């Protein structure tokens, strides 16, 4: 048997309110886009911002 | 007289190979287990060939 | 000075060659992309004291003649081009070929050899070479600042650059197939070259015209079955001992004849 590669489940998690205002959550399809100092483009769904 | 014993050795090795393949290919979703079948050989009569 | 002595000498030599091929097969059992060797013999000529079916009289014939053998001669030690087990290494610069074909390699003298072992590296200039400094014939060059190298199911190889959001194709790995795969003469470092025995190679992309497929991250191990080499060795040892016994018997009868 050979591993065909791990696949990730994109099912949305539970939306939990933990106070504060500088935080966003996505309940459906959508990926936040980020750019690093070197200029590359990355995609993440984390809601922590500062 | 090594012919019969060698043939039996190869048959046992093949059976172990099939068993090992079945046990190793566990958890594979689209898998159906295998099974080896054997058959004797005779030249005429009273003359075994493994 | 006795025909039996020469016959037994030929038998001893045949068993010695068989033992040699067994030893070589057992030696490189872990060599990647190694094909085992099998030796095949034949009987030598025959001395006909009485011709079979000779007209012994006007209406009767000999049902069987009188013929004496002259020993055994090894025909050839061919190489069995079976399919080796595909291991897994999770590397980026080694490919396993499943099916038929060979990678072409540009020898330093100028000609080209053919290999079955896929373990590629990069030389100082950046071009893809095999383990041993020999470069592939299409001369695939890997550019600097390469984030990753991918090789598809077919021969196309691409490299992901730092940016551009898209991989860029860098070349293709076409492999060559022969007609008489067992007719290629083998030289060192897992290389083969063609002779009169094998036809002119025809190159093609993997997956077409009977060619194999390329899997990245795997490697083809040798098709040496260590389980049966031992029993073959046992049989070879017994046969060699019996031939030596025949030599000893001939010597004994000669000695007890010359004592007169």
CA within 13 Å, CB half, C60:
3
State residue C104 phi and psi, 5-degree precision: -80, 140
State residue C255 phi and psi, 5-degree precision: -65, -45
Q: Answer yes or no: do B6 and C231 touch at CB < 8 A.
A: yes
- Residue by residue, what is the 3-state secondary structure of B1-50? CHHHHHHHHHHHHHHHHHHHHHHHCCCCCCCCCCCCCCCCCECCCCCECC
Q: How far is CA B26 from CA A3, B23, B32, B33, C90, in A?
A: 12, 6, 10, 9, 21
DSSP string, A9-35: ----------S-SSB---SSS--EEEE
Q: Which residues of B touch C231 (CB under 8 A)?
A: 2, 6, 9
Spatial CA neighbour of C193 closest among C79, C115, C87: C115
The DSSP code for C184 is: P
Interface test with C, best of B10, B14, B24, B50 (most C CBs within 10 A): B10
Experimental method: cryo-EM
State the resolution, in angstroms. 3.2
Under a CB-based contact definition with an 8 Å cutoff, are residues A27 and A10 in contact?
A: no
H/E run at residue C246: helix C226-258
3-state secondary structure of C76: strand
A31 φ/ψ sector (left φ>0, alpha ψ -120 to 50, else beta) = beta
How is residue C232 written in tokens? 């073959």
d(Cα C158, Cα C170) in Å, to the nearest integer? Answer: 5
Across the strands, what pairs with C22? Answer: none
Spatial CA neighbour of C71 closest among C95, C90, C44, C111: C44
Task: Please provide the distance, in angstroms rounded to a whole number, between the alpha carbons at the two ends of chain B.
Answer: 10
The DSSP code for C146 is: -
Under a CB-based contact definition with an 8 Å cutoff, are residues C208 and C177 in contact?
A: no
Spatial CA neighbour of C191 closest among C35, C18, C28: C35
- Name the C residues in 171-230 with CB < 8 Å from any B CB: 227-228
3-state secondary structure of C185: strand
d(Cα C227, Cα C48) in Å, to the nearest integer? Answer: 43
Biggest CA–CA distance in chain A, Å, is 49
Cβ-based neighbours of C15, under 8 Å, separated by 6 or more: C236, C239, C240, C243
Alpha helices in C155-223 (DSSP H): none
Query: Rounded to a whole number, what is the distance in Å from the CA of B46 to chain C's nearest CA?
Result: 25
Spatial CA neighbour of C39 closest among C57, C27, C25: C25
d(Cα C245, Cα C4) in Å, to the nearest integer? Answer: 12
C33 φ/ψ sector (left φ>0, alpha ψ -120 to 50, else beta) = left
Hunting for tokens 């099912």 — which residue is that? A11
Interface test with C, best of B3, B4, B6, B16 (most C CBs within 10 A): B6
Going by their DSSP bridges, the two strands C112-115 and C168-172 should be labelled as: unpaired
Under a CB-based contact definition with an 8 Å cutoff, are residues C122 and C142 in contact?
A: yes
Across the strands, what pairs with C66? Answer: C50
Q: Which residues of C touch B10 (CB under 8 A)?
A: 228
Across the strands, what pairs with A43? Answer: A33
State residue C8 phi and psi, 5-degree precision: -65, -35
Note the Cα A28 to chain centre separation in Å. Answer: 11
Across the strands, what pairs with C147? Answer: none
Biggest CA–CA distance in chain B, Å, is 48
Contacts of C130-133 spanning 24+ positions with Cβ under 8 A: C130/C103, C130/C105, C132/C189
A33 at C interface, C-beta within 8 A? no
d(Cα C244, Cα C8) in Å, to the nearest integer? Answer: 8
């Amino acid at each position: 048997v050979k591993v065909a590669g791990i696949t990730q489940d994109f099912t949305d998690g539970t939306t939990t309110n933990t106070g504060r205002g500088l935080d966003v959550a996505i309940s459906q399809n959508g990926f936040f886009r980020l750019v690093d100092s070197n200029g590359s483009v990355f995609y993440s769904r984390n809601g922590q911002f500062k | 007289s090594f012919s019969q014993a060698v043939s039996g050795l190869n048959a046992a090795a093949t059976n172990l190979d099939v068993i090992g393949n079945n046990i190793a290919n566990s958890a594979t979703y689209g898998f159906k287990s295998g099974t080896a079948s054997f058959a004797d050989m005779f030249a005429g009569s009273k003359v075994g060939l493994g | 000075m006795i025909s039996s002595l020469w016959i037994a000498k030929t038998g001893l030599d045949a068993q010695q060659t068989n033992m040699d091929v067994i030893a070589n097969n057992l030696a490189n059992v872990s060599t990647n992309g190694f094909k085992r060797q099998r030796a095949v013999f034949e009987d030598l000529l025959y001395q006909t004291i009485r011709q079979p079916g000779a007209q012994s009289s006007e209406q009767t014939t000999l049902p069987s003649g009188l013929q004496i053998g002259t020993g055994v001669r090894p025909v050839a030690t061919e190489r069995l081009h079976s399919q080796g087990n595909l291991s897994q290494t999770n590397n980026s610069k080694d490919v396993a070929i499943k099916g038929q074909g060979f990678f072409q390699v540009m020898l330093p003298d100028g000609t080209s050899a053919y290999t079955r072992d896929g373990s590629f590296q990069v030389d100082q200039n950046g071009q893809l070479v095999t383990a041993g400094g020999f470069q592939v014939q299409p001369a695939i060059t890997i550019p600097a600042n390469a984030l990753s190298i991918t090789i598809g199911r077919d021969g196309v190889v691409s490299v992901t650059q730092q940016g551009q959001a898209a991989p860029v194709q860098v070349g293709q790995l076409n492999l060559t197939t022969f007609m008489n795969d067992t007719g290629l003469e083998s030289i060192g470092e897992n290389l083969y070259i063609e002779t009169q025995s094998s036809g002119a190679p025809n190159e093609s992309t993997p997956g077409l015209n009977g060619a194999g497929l390329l899997y990245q991250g795997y490697v083809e191990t040798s098709n040496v079955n260590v389980a049966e080499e031992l029993v073959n060795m046992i049989q070879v040892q017994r046969a060699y001992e019996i031939n030596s016994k025949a030599v000893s018997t001939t010597d004994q009868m000669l000695q007890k004849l010359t004592q007169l």
